Design a protein around this ligand. Structure first.
Ligand SMILES: N[C@@H](CCC(=O)N[C@@H](CS[C@H](CO)COc1ccc([N+](=O)[O-])cc1)C(=O)NCC(=O)O)C(=O)O
Ligand SMILES: N[C@@H](CCC(=O)N[C@@H](CS[C@H](CO)COc1ccc([N+](=O)[O-])cc1)C(=O)NCC(=O)O)C(=O)O
Lengths: 217, 217
């Protein structure tokens, strides 16, 4: 049994949670709590940051016995290696590495906007360059089942999470209809993922920390 | 022969340059130019961004025949695989994946500060938290020769680049003295690294884009 440590929000741990469910890895969760508004006291975490034995303490973390990890990408790669959900050939590895890093860029660009107090002033600019970014991903996937080829890999779980955040933001964006819509359903159709979403362990919201100008709950 | 595209700065391509040199990969460079101040016209790149055949156009890129890549970490992984400078055991791969992502955090937190107009206001806060970040790295490396074990890996190139930046910023920081100072020298003492540094291909500056509040040239 493994332990996943993160806040009581969706954030970065969403794709990790889906992956642990898909792989049927026995896990429990250390959800951390902030104090009330407006202070949002990080005490719950900060009093424990150093006593966990992590090499570079951060959130999320995963503990699997004496394996003690930080960094979301690193945590996903670890579960993926135990389940053969990494690339197999070099071209598949090239696809994983590029997408892993590109999706973080798209991730990070969206978070910046929703955390900035100039949110309203920045919104239109983001929405302009968005369809083009979406068109790039639509070109990449092509008529493929999954993003790296025929095999489901952990990058598909990142793609879904990133795509899901954009769909929650502007659900009417026509560049999200097409093979990119096909992809979202096909992932949600997966046996273990669908049953996870039908349960009460599922966290569709909030995507962001409470000090964000945008959220879904 | 391979082609590395990036601006005429140090930036993100520093680690990749050192790597291409250490591995003796034959390469040339498409270095991109901005217009003069204050506009800094990006047109040399923008007029070309789409015609290169990259899946997700960005800088740096690398072209090695029909392999055409973007994202710095993905570019480094590709050269590393050709020269067995990735992890070998599970433990080694755990260390590579966590450090790859951790050092990007460190890299980006520093960039944030040096591009912020509130630079002077934020400088003291950064310098308080920094000794602790450096002590974490110092504990991790330990008495080891390299960061992932016995073998040089691509993560040691990222480590050096990130540490070099801190060393240029605050050279008198006492937490930089010790095994992390030994590490910097050891890397610079590498036969093909040292030679590259004694040449005129070598770019110790500027670390940042010109719009930055801090730089070394
Ligand atoms: N590269 C690292 C980053 C870890 C990190 O950022 N730690 C945050 C997380 S999220 C932060 C809190 O609001 C979340 O904000 C975001 C950012 C992006 C997205 N997103 O979806 O793209 C959502 C929320 C933190 O709570 N701990 C910092 C600390 O203890 O010092 C990784 O991969 O794990
Ligand atoms: N995660 C990617 C990032 C690539 C990227 O940022 N391309 C930027 C400049 S890098 C940029 C220029 O100002 C960086 O800002 C900095 C500056 C310094 C440092 N650093 O580590 O010191 C990091 C980022 C660019 O030229 N392309 C933008 C575009 O084509 O739209 C990767 O790993 O490659």
């Amino acid at each position: 049994v493994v332990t996943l440590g993160y806040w009581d929000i969706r954030g970065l741990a969403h794709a990790i949670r889906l992956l642990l469910e898909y792989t049927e890895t026995p896990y429990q969760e250390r959800r951390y709590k902030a104090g009330p508004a407006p202070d949002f006291d990080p005490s719950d975490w900060t009093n424990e940051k150093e006593k966990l034995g992590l090499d570079f303490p951060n959130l999320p973390y995963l503990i699997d016995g004496d394996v003690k990890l930080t960094q979301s990408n690193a945590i996903l790669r670890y579960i993926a290696r135990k389940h053969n959900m990494c690339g197999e050939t070099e071209v598949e590895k090239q696809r994983v590495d590029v997408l892993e890093n590109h999706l973080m860029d798209l991730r990070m660009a969206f978070a910046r906007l929703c955390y900035s107090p100039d949110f309203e002033k920045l919104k239109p600019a983001y929405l302009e360059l968005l369809p083009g970014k979406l068109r790039q991903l639509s070109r990449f996937l092509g008529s493929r089942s999954w993003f790296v080829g025929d095999k489901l890999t952990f990058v598909d779980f990142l793609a879904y999470d990133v795509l899901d955040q954009q769909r929650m933001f502007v659900p009417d964006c026509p560049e999200l209809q097409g093979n990119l819509s096909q992809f979202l359903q096909r992932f949600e159709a997966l046996e273990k993922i669908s049953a996870y979403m039908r349960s009460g362990r599922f966290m569709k919201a909030p995507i962001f920390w409470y000090t964000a100008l945008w959220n879904n709950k």
